[PDB]
Amino acid sequence: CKNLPYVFINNIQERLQTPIPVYLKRAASLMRMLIRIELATVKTLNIT
């Protein structure tokens, strides 16, 4: 979830962990929310 906004830049900048613009942090808000719901520990107990 912390690296999700790099889907809007590329894998070169994700490796270097350069700063992310604020408008691209907002763009990943719904998907970060959904990932934290559907991948909660209460749901991913049997996943290896």
Partner 1 sequence: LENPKISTFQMNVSACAWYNADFDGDQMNLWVPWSVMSRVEAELLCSVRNWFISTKSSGPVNGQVQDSTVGSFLLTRTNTPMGKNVMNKLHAMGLFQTTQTDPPCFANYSPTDLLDGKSVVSMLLRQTPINYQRAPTWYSEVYAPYMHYNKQDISTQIRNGELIEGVLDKKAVGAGSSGGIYHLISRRYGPQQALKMIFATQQLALNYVRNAGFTVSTADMLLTPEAHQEVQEIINELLLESEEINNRLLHGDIMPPIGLTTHDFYEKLQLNALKFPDRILKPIMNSINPETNGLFQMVATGAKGSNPNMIHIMAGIGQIEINTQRIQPQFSFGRTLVYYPRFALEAQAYGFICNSYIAGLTSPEFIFGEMNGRFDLINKALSTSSTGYANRKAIFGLQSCIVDYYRRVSIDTRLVQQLYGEDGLDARQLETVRFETIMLSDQELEDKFKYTGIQSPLFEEEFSRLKKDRDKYRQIFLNVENFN
Partner 2 sequence: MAMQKLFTYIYEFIEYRKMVLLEEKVPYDKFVQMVLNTGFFRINAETLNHGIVSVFIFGANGKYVHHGGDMRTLLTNTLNEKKHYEELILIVDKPVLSKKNILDIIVEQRAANPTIVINIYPYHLFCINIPKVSAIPKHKLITQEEAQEFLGREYLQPQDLMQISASDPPVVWLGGRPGDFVQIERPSETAMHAVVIRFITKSKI
**Residue 15 contact, options partner 1, partner 2, none, Cβ 5-8 Å cut-off depending on partner type:** none
**CB under 8 Å to 3, separation ≥6 — which residues?**
14
Told to check if 11 binds partner 1 by CB under 8 A, we report no
Told to check if 13 binds partner 1 by CB under 8 A, we report no
Told to check if 24 binds partner 1 by CB under 8 A, we report yes
Using CB under 8 A, list all residues that contact partner 1: 8, 23-24, 27, 30, 32-34, 36-37, 40-42
